[PDB]
Amino acid sequence: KWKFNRTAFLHQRQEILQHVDVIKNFSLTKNSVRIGQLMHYDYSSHKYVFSISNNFRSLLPDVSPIMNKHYNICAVVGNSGILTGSQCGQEIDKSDFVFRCNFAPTEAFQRDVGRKTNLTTFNPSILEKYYNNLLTIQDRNNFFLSLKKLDGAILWIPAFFFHTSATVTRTLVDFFVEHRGQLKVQLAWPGNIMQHVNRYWKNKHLSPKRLSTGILMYTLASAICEEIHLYGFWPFGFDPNTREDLPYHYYDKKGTKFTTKWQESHQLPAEFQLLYRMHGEGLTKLTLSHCA
Amino acid sequence: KWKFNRTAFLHQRQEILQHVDVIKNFSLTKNSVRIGQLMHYDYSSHKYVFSISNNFRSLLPDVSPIMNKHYNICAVVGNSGILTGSQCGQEIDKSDFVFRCNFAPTEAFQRDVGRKTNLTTFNPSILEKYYNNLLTIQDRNNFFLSLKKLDGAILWIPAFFFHTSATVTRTLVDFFVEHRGQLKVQLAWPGNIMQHVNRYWKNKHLSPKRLSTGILMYTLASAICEEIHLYGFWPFGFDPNTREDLPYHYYDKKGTKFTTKWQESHQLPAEFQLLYRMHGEGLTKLTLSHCA
Ligand SMILES: *[C@@H]1O[C@H](CO)[C@@H](O[C@@H]2O[C@H](CO)[C@@H](O[C@@H]3O[C@H](CO)[C@@H](O)[C@H](O)[C@@H]3O)[C@H](O)[C@H]2NC(C)=O)[C@H](O)[C@H]1NC(C)=O
Ligand SMILES: *[C@@H]1O[C@H](CO[C@@H]2O[C@@H](C)[C@@H](O)[C@@H](O)[C@@H]2O)[C@@H](O[C@@H]2O[C@H](CO)[C@@H](O)[C@H](O)[C@H]2NC(C)=O)[C@H](O)[C@H]1NC(C)=O
Ligand SMILES: CC(=O)Nc1cccc([C@@H](OP(=O)(O)OC[C@H]2O[C@@H](n3ccc(N)nc3=O)[C@H](O)[C@@H]2O)P(=O)(O)O)c1
Ligand SMILES: CC(=O)Nc1cccc([C@@H](OP(=O)(O)OC[C@H]2O[C@@H](n3ccc(N)nc3=O)[C@H](O)[C@@H]2O)P(=O)(O)O)c1
Ligand SMILES: *[C@@H]1O[C@H](CO)[C@@H](O[C@@H]2O[C@H](CO)[C@@H](O)[C@H](O)[C@H]2NC(C)=O)[C@H](O)[C@H]1NC(C)=O
Ligand SMILES: *[C@@H]1O[C@H](CO)[C@@H](O[C@@H]2O[C@H](CO)[C@@H](O)[C@H](O)[C@H]2NC(C)=O)[C@H](O)[C@H]1NC(C)=O
Ligand SMILES: *[C@@H]1O[C@H](CO)[C@@H](O[C@@H]2O[C@H](CO)[C@@H](O)[C@H](O)[C@H]2NC(C)=O)[C@H](O)[C@H]1NC(C)=O
Ligand SMILES: *[C@@H]1O[C@H](CO)[C@@H](O[C@@H]2O[C@H](CO)[C@@H](O)[C@H](O)[C@H]2NC(C)=O)[C@H](O)[C@H]1NC(C)=O
Ligand SMILES: *[C@@H]1O[C@H](CO)[C@@H](O)[C@H](O)[C@H]1NC(C)=O
Ligand SMILES: *[C@@H]1O[C@H](CO)[C@@H](O)[C@H](O)[C@H]1NC(C)=O
């Protein structure tokens, strides 16, 4: 049914590149920050600051981790409940490169979402919510194991979007410095990039207070992928094909009720409408049904 | 009326020294920890750990700051509301060396508590209560100025008593590293010393889960002071003479003062009884009334 239009996608890549230097915005590098430099937060009041320490700078890459990288078929996997029972795991894992959002689980869900991960995003407040601020030996060990499972994947850590990241970023930084060289995980640390990313999408008549992680991933992916297939983008409470109730997230327990006010800060429906148009124009393949 | 018994005090000093190496226990030093060493907490479950970083080690003194120090008259100033209207400021400031507790304010209270400070203690959670975790420029500036007012005094920071210190300690460390050489404050960082300090006081029929900061100060002071005068030790909500309501702290008097189970922390009444016996034996002078 769906047919890729390579030319139109590459024109979209060029248009994104005119508004966002993706290669650079992908991560701060050692030489782009000074020790003692005060960072601000893209989505918090300007009064919030974070001072760049020696240790933080030592975790930055020397060069963009996506410089001169090229992947043919990319999967960007959002977190919609539409993936549950899709059996898309195998097809996602055939991709050259898979992006995942917010350290999403794969273990109990591989048949549907895959086990391949080449990048996953990581808001530092994950440490507070799921790893008890790395306070105990067992917390530390659980986090270490989760990192080890990523192998050489990129962990894309946006520490300068929300001021609530500030204290937990120091804990994260200390852990990584303490374990330097023990893990193959490639760290990436984007800076204040949402002002640049928002410019491309304002032109496409999309102006939320906040763009979603999913669409941020598409934006990055545009620069390094030749063809992008989207999974788990479907911000609605029902299945499009069956009409049955659907959870918001694929990892939600069965029967969990789609939450209306979960997504009041986002404009996922407007994002989705725009991706859906893009699907129709052959720019990207939006998957909304079970895979083969 | 009160008369110092030098002989009995010297016998107390010698006894304390046989159970606690005060000079060593006063502070961890650079060479007494390794980078990557896991610290445990004296008053928390053993599962809680804190990994010693490069930066933390860099804030440790090379040698115990009290090594070979000897002061004649020391004042140890607890934080009781009994100091309010005592006019003990001048008498406290005549001491050769003054110890204060938990970074207690002196500016608005000098007539009663003095302006002299040679050491003050600092639970790191002070940053969370009074300096908003150093999240803004104004918070950072306030904390800096409070530090600058200490001049070359010792800031005695027990980061390894309560696991709840862990995350704020990283904030504190980052601030001090960031501002290295800008302040004259001498940092001291005691480690796991409460097991040793408790041994002397167990023999004196005092066995709380936790000895108070005030009595810990007495213990330290015994090694470096010829004579110790106590002020602001009075763990009761009432004036000793009138029985009228008294604030728990001299600085936290007027205002909608949240009243909780602050008493359940410490066995302060038993400490106070013991200090009161000691006063009677001429070991130390416990002041419970106006100075002028
Ligand atoms: C994210 O990417 C944006 C661009 O999409 C980065 O901003 C751009 O940074 C470049 C430097 O790499 C600026 O180039 C400069 O052009 C000016 C003319 O205005 C010239 O005077 C300079 O010599 C330099 O060549 C460019 O102005 C700037 N664009 C915008 C819109 O600000 C931004 O730094 C990236 N941020 C991160 C954190 O990677
Ligand atoms: C990069 O991928 C293109 C597209 O591949 C097809 O679509 C993918 C999503 C996936 O389903 C692939 O298995 C498909 O082949 C490749 O172009 C195709 O090459 C094949 C095999 O050599 C050829 O027979 C097809 O007709 C081509 N299809 C299209 C639509 O052009 C391309 O070769 C890939 N390049 C590299 C170096 O990996
Ligand atoms: C309370 C709260 O966390 N809200 C909230 C609301 C919407 C999205 C998100 C985060 O995204 P996640 O739910 O982890 O989902 C990953 C991505 O998947 C997409 N998504 C998710 C669920 C869904 N039913 N349909 C979708 O399209 C969307 O593009 C989203 O960014 P964010 O974006 O980091 O902020 C968080
Ligand atoms: C929830 C909480 O913090 N509780 C709590 C309860 C009692 C004391 C303290 C702390 O002491 P502060 O109140 O800062 O006072 C400093 C010292 O002064 C003494 N003190 C204080 C008030 C008072 N009314 N009588 C006293 O004898 C006591 O020896 C105490 O250790 P800590 O001890 O760091 O733990 C804290
Ligand atoms: C791929 O997409 C491009 C761009 O949207 C298509 O090229 C356009 O074709 C229409 C035909 O109505 C013309 O009006 C435009 O002027 C063309 N624009 C450009 C920039 O070329 C192209 O037809 C699409 N390809 C397929 C195979 O459907
Ligand atoms: C993308 O990530 C996956 C891991 O999820 C990488 O695939 C693994 O590659 C190693 C080393 O060759 C194999 O031994 C594993 O069996 C592969 N795992 C899976 C799940 O397929 C893959 O190489 C990465 N791709 C990149 C960086 O292009
Ligand atoms: C506090 O002082 C005590 C001595 O009063 C030290 O305890 C000694 O520690 C060593 C090894 O670290 C043991 O082999 C000795 O047997 C210990 N003596 C006693 C009486 O237990 C203690 O190390 C000091 N701690 C700190 C952090 O300074
Ligand atoms: C104890 O601390 C006080 C400061 O609180 C020291 O006294 C200051 O000494 C300086 C420099 O000699 C004078 O200019 C100040 O006027 C003094 N201030 C006050 C308030 O007295 C004192 O020297 C310290 N004592 C010891 C023994 O270290
Ligand atoms: C000093 O204290 C000792 C020890 O308890 C005692 O023998 C001596 O009489 C005391 N001196 C006085 C009260 O002057
Ligand atoms: C200790 O202080 C007292 C009280 O002022 C004083 O008389 C005595 O000489 C002092 N001892 C010294 C300085 O050695």
Packing angle of the helix pair A194-203, A213-224 (nearest 10 deg): 90
Q: Dihedrals φ, ψ of B31, to 5°?
A: -80, 0
Domains for chain A: give ranges and CATH numbers.
Answer: 1-292 (3.90.1480.20)
- What is the residue-wise DSSP string for A218-263? HHHHHHHEEEEEEES---SSB-TTT--B--SBTTSPTTPPPPSGGG
How are beta strands B38-39 and B50-51 bridged, if at all? antiparallel
Ligand 1 midpoint to CA B37 (Å): 43
CB atoms within 10 A of CB A244: 8
A170 to chain B, any CB pair closer than 8 A? The answer is yes
CA triple A55-A59-A65, angle to 5 deg: 160
Nearest to A44 by CA among A163, A197, A167: A163
Write down the catalytic residue from B179, B266, B279, B290: B266
Nearest to B167 among A51, A133, A175 (CB): A133
Q: CA-CA distance, B56 to B58, in Å (whole number)?
A: 5
User: Resolution of this entry in Å?
Assistant: 2.2
Q: CA-CA distance, A101 to A20, in Å (whole number)?
A: 20
Q: Enumerate residues 172 to 211 of chain B having a beta carbon within 8 A of any beta carbon in chain A.
A: 174, 177-178
Longest dimension (CA), chain B: 55
Tally: H helices and E strands in chain A: 11, 9
Q: Dihedrals φ, ψ of A4, to 5°?
A: -65, 135
Q: CA-CA distance, A141 to A86, in Å (whole number)?
A: 33
**Are B49 and A178 an interchain contact pair (Cβ–Cβ within 8 Å)?**
no
For chain A, the residue count is: 292
Ligand 7 midpoint to CA B269 (Å): 29
Ligand nearest to the CA of B188: 7
Q: Which two tokens stand for residue A34?
A: 């000074």
Cβ atoms of B116 and B153 closer than 8 Å: no
Write down the catalytic residue from A11, A266, A279, A290: A266
Shortest Cα distance from A173 to chain B (angstroms)? Answer: 10
Taking phi first (over 0 means left), then psi (-120 to 50 degrees means alpha), and beta for anything else, what does residue A282 get? Answer: left
CA triple A171-A173-A175, angle to 5 deg: 70
**Are A49 and B166 an interchain contact pair (Cβ–Cβ within 8 Å)?**
no
| DSSP run (H or E) holding A92 | helix A89-94
Rounded to whole angstroms, what are the CA distances from A215 to A80, A100, A208, B9?
A: 13, 12, 12, 73
First CA to last CA distance, chain A: 14
Q: Is B167 exposed, middle or buried (0-12, 13-18, 19+ CB in 10 A)?
A: buried
| DSSP run (H or E) holding A76 | strand A71-77
Ligand 6 close to Cβ of residue A116 (< 6 A):
yes
Q: CA-CA distance, B222 to B200, in Å (whole number)?
A: 12
The three-state DSSP-derived secondary structure of chain B is CCCCCHHHHHHHHHHHHHHCCHHHHCCCCHHHCCCCCEECCCCCCCCECEECCHHHHHCCCCCCCCCCCCEEEEEEECCCHHHCCCCCHHHHHHCCEEEECCCCCCHHHHHHHCCCCCEEECCCCHHHHHCHHHCEHHHHHHHHHHHHCCCCCEEECCCCCCHHHHHHHHHHHHHHHHCCCCCCCEEECCCCCHHHHHHHHHHCCCCCCCCCHHHHHHHHHHHHEEEEEEECCCCCCECCCCCCECCCCCCCCCCCCCCCCCHHHCCHHHHHHHHHHHHHCCCCEECCCCCC
Answer positive or negative: Cα dihedral of A283, A279, A268, A189.
Answer: negative
First CA to last CA distance, chain B: 15
CA triple A268-A271-A274, angle to 5 deg: 150
Q: Which residues of A63-97 are buried (b: 16+ CB within 10 A; e: fewer)?
A: ebbbeeeebeebbbbbbbbbbbebebbebbeebeb
Collect all residues with Cβ–Cβ distance below 8 Å to B183 and sequence separation of at least 6.
B144, B147, B148, B150
Compute and round to an integer the Cα radius of gyration of chain A: 19
Q: Is A132 exposed, middle or buried (0-12, 13-18, 19+ CB in 10 A)?
A: middle
Ligand 1 close to Cβ of residue A191 (< 6 A):
yes
Interface contacts (A, B; CB < 8 Å):
61
Interface test with B, best of A33, A38, A53 (most B CBs within 10 A): A53
**Are B174 and A54 an interchain contact pair (Cβ–Cβ within 8 Å)?**
no
Q: Which residues of B207-244 are buried (b: 16+ CB within 10 A; e: fewer)?
A: eeeebbbbbbbbbbbbbbbebbbbbbbbbbeeeeeeee
Q: CA-CA distance, A97 to A12, in Å (whole number)?
A: 20
Amino acid letter for position B238: F
Catalytic-residue membership of A40: no
Collect all residues with Cβ–Cβ distance below 8 Å to B130 and sequence separation of at least 6.
none
